Amino acid sequence: RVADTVGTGPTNSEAIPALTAAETGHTSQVVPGDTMQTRHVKNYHSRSESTVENFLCRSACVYFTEYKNSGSKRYAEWVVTTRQAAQLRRKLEFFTYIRFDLELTFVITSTQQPSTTQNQDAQILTHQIMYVPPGGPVPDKVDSYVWQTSTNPSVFWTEGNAPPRMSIPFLSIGNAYSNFYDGWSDFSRDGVYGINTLNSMGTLYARHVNTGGTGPIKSTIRIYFKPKHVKAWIPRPPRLCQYEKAKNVNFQPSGVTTTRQSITAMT
Amino acid sequence: RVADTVGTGPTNSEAIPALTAAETGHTSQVVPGDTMQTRHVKNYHSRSESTVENFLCRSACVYFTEYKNSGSKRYAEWVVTTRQAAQLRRKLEFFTYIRFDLELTFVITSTQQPSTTQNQDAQILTHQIMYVPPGGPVPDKVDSYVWQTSTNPSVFWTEGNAPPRMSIPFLSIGNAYSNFYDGWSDFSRDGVYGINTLNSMGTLYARHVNTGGTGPIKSTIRIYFKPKHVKAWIPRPPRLCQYEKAKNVNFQPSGVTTTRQSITAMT
Amino acid sequence: SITTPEEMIEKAKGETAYLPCKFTLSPEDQGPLDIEWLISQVIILYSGDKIYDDYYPDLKGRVHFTSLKSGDASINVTNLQDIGTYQCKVKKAPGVANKKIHLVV
Amino acid sequence: SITTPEEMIEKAKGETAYLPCKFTLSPEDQGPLDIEWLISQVIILYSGDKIYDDYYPDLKGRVHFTSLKSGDASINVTNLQDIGTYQCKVKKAPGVANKKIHLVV
Amino acid sequence: KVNSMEAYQIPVRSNEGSGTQVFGFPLQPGYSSVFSRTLLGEILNYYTHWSGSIKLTFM
Amino acid sequence: GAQVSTQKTGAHIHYTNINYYKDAASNSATRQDFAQDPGKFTEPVKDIMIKSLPALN
Amino acid sequence: GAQVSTQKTGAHIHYTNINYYKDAASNSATRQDFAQDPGKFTEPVKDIMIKSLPALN
Amino acid sequence: ASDECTAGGFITCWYQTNIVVPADAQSSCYIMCFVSACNDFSVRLLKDTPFISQENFF
Amino acid sequence: GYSDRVRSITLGNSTITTQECANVVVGYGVWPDYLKDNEATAEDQPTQPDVATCRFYTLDSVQWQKTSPGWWWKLPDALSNLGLFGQNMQYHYLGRTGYTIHVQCNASKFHQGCLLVVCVPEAEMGCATLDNTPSSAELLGGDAAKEFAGEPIASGSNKLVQRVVYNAGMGIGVGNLTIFPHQWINLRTNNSATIVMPYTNSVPMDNMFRHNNVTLMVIPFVPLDYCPGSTTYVPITVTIAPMNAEYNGLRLAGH
Amino acid sequence: GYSDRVRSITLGNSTITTQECANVVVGYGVWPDYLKDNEATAEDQPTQPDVATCRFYTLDSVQWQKTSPGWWWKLPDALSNLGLFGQNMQYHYLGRTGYTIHVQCNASKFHQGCLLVVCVPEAEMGCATLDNTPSSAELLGGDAAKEFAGEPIASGSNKLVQRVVYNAGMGIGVGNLTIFPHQWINLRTNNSATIVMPYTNSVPMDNMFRHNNVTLMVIPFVPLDYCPGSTTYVPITVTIAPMNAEYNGLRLAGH
């Protein structure tokens, strides 16, 4: 619940609450009553929806890839990383370090690709989403032994069912995911520099269990990340310039702020 | 929870913890503080995911067979055995004897086979999975009296439903499944030699309850085994060479280990 | 199931060659016993408790079961000339096993 | 993964040009290493632990790996004339990275 | 030598010198070939994250 | 073993939560955590600066 | 007849389990069994060998 | 798996002196090395092993 | 005074004495004992000789050449033809027994070498040809060395067991074998190794002819090396003593 | 059981193990300790790494030929260029530290010999020419043997230090040196010798570059003798570990 205002009458004293010294770095804790007369108003407003958990708990798509059931791209391979998208990435960046559990949800959508094969009566499609942990064997063809599933966590979802949702516990060798890393993987300081060097969360593979039918069908899989049980440390200024790459913080110089007419203009 | 380290200062004594005798077969129980100076670090890490139950509880496909709704192969007959696959088989072998309950899950997928019959408007497919216990009557045609089901446990699953999952209690005449058997079934010592002689767990039959439609449809059934309530005895070294057969341990001689450049090389 | 499935039996011309196909049946196996012999094509067949010559010209009246459902399906080919791989396929509904024998001389 | 993916290497005619394609592999990367070099089309290929000339007429016998799976895929093109963008595409199943080098003189 | 029992033996001998290196390998119980097929290393290859000490016992 | 907590209502009610999965990483989001402390970022000075008193004496 | 046990949480919570099927072979996996004894395989010698004391006297 | 961020370190052996032997005795000795995990070893994140392989069911 | 090296094991009517020996390895920590009634499955009154069978049997010595890859003995098969342990094994159907393996190999101070004396339960081995299994008398040996061969066994239409030492015939790393109860015979310090093996089978009792529960494998990790002038024929002799023999199902002799 | 020979010394992050060793000689009976405040004279807060500097440093091995007269190491100078002990020595002005000298020389049972491992405080040495003193790099050696020479050093217009072994370069009887803490390396029984030396200086602290308080001298009283066929290159390696390092007067690096 937010703090309320306290009444004040006219004042005339040596003490000055307004005049301060911003050089110290202490933001003045001045309430409205300090520089005027105010009534006693009980503010029942609550800072409930501004909580870090409520701020970042919304499901937000990070990456969508499309795999056909017949042709060159039989299966889809995406390295896990929240940097691919923009809205969720920017939300997370606000904090230099962050420690959150994940609740991945997959929205899979099929589409009969235009073709000329007749008597297209396809049976219900079945899909498999496999999470390869880093250092694990990775599939090369749609039907390799890796797809059989030995110990990796995979979910089998027939089309038309409620979208699959598997929760992921915090997965980081360190004590918190580092949103920003001012360091190189190599002690020599030569090589990749940035968040990509320390963040590896495995790879995600999506394939058609059954070909489905005579005609080609293209399956779009959308991956949604919702941070839960989030704890954030060291708040940082929000990214002002548009993102240009996923593996680095490189940016294009942009105006501090959208301009207005004059210094006295009100638009 | 894992044990933690204990602090130690400089030492100078007759007692030697490092110098030992590996001939005895006792692996030295030397903590880090014995051969250096170490601080008191409370290790909160837990050996929870290395438990035998957590190690082998992952669902893992063992065998997939494909049966058409019209043609030569109307029904699919697979003898139950975890040796057909590689990942789950290797996981189980780590222990000479093992006693686990089973939770079979079947992932069935249909596919409209290319043909020329027109007006292919197939109705929803219905499948039946029947477990014939050893010594029980076995179906010869897709429509024999055996399919009617007298006492054998069978599951009827219409396509598009959640995949069928029936749990199996421990099924072994002995007191534990023997992963390795250095013995012959015949007292004379002439005949089959190995795990196949003592492990018979019955046969699995899968068929189309209804033909489904005018056009031919091929149904792929994938069988998943997840050991539960597992108890393992006598740990053994993991299978170094690639498996060549399902009924025997026969192997092709392979290098102890992948080679490197020299004895001082760091790659 | 069949004992020693890969075998190489070399025998001189003029004497009967004994080709063993001894098999052991699992408890799960409860099916009609179909024993078929192939050469590289069908030499003999055993279905419905009867033996079939199968009109093979190269080996007619020279091939017979030495023993049967007891577990023996061996063949004593007589008066060899015949060189090839002899495949014996005992058949059961849960599992069908085959044995290949290379014959020399 | 590849160090300095955009590069502009200008070198005078007559001396070998060293084109670096040093790469670092993520833990998630466990795939066959396919290194392919392109010019603006395929100069060299590395699949199955072997090097391929690829019969490129402009650069045959003048292009070789300076070092390998260790992390180096550089090329020392010899006896330049060749001006163009040289693209090095180290390949892994989770991620495939490419490096473009503009060569002058 | 990976195709013989010579893979395990580490060779030492009386040489007229001192400080000569006997062997050497990186601490990668999972990835390093030296440790990959050892009982600790092979079980480790069934996991992704590892932490703790190692008792290298030289006989 | 059900945990009963107050629902988020207006100003000027109970709901029952039972943890089904034993993993504990599957628990619903812990939204009801209204705790704040601006001192870490706002007013980070080592020596207290009373607002009424002059800042730089 | 519900059994309440602690959920697997981090270091530095309860869940409720009710057995529906009476067969008892249908019960969920018993993952929470953190018991170990290395003596059977490690240190299998008949006579105790104190690490500090010399091994072969 | 290998990673520049988490390089474990280097383990090596050297001759502090020389392996001196008397006459009529071999001067080429061998040394065996064993590996084990201390009582403070932990693992997490199960994955399928990359050493096993399979083409078709056996 | 006291000394750890010296040890004397007495069983039945035959005892052994080792001046230099390493501590005995007691199997998996379970000293062998008779079948308790909580887990019995044979209703017949078991015969327990307890002296006639529980005695130290000395098998045939084998030479440890500098070129010798290894040796394996199927313990039940090894004693099938020696004394009453063999006779009672031939007669009775079921047989349960613990083992007291002891391998002796003594060499002078100037010899060098190292053996791995390890007993492996369920040593299912693989034939040279993948399709067929090894035959008896190739896999098994009666008081016979059954030596390993370093070279990979040629794979043809035969039933020769893979003797590849670097795989131990089980397609597993030979170094990783240490998991099984094991004692090393480093010539420099200990000339003898003793493992007391409990009865390790999934069933309360099993026919010894039908199946061999444990197999003693001696694999020289470091080859024997000696300067000219030393004894060139240093043997390895194995003395296996059964313990707590318990037999059921008396029938006519044979198999 | 117990055994006097075996001993294990752990310091910092590096420990040493000696199977055969004679009892450690603890200096003059005073185990080294940090400077007590009853006798301090530097008012600056001393830095005490206590792990970074107090660790076993292994110097360069030296060959013990049958013709080798002896060797001397100025302990402070020897470690001047090794690790933080060297870095902190270069930076700080004053330096007080105890020493844990350990000399290793292993030989087979058929070798013979005898060393005198003795640490001498204030080993002021004499130049070949009486009028001038020896120069640095002749008297001192960085990780260098600084070997003694049996023949008297020719005396000319030079600064060569007298390496005469029968005088030890100090014009004193080498046999009488025993007064200083000393441990013998008789090859027949002990292959190692350890002396723990306390900080022995007249002032509470002294600059280590300015003056070397103690010098480890290894003088073979009985020459190495072996019959043909034995190893002819038996080295002597010295591992000196500092203890209780205490440094004052932080300045810019150099000297």
Side-chain angles (χ1 to χ4, degrees), chain I residues 60-82:
Chain I
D60 275 342
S61 297
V62 297
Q63 178 180 9
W64 181 6
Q65 315 175 358
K66 58 179 60 63
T67 63
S68 291
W71 307 268
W72 81 80
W73 293 268
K74 308 285 173 185
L75 302 187
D77 185 61
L79 296 173
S80 77
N81 56 327
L82 267 51

Side-chain angles (χ1 to χ4, degrees), chain B residues 9-19 34-37, chain J residues 3-12 15 17 19 24 31:
Chain B
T11 185
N12 187 324
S13 68
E14 194 174 5
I16 61 171
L19 286 176
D34 293 342
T35 66
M36 65 180 288
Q37 293 193 64
Chain J
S3 188
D4 176 334
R5 314 281 271 290
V6 58
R7 173 167 299 275
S8 173
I9 314 176
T10 178
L11 285 185
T15 181
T17 302
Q19 303 296 326
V24 174
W31 190 274

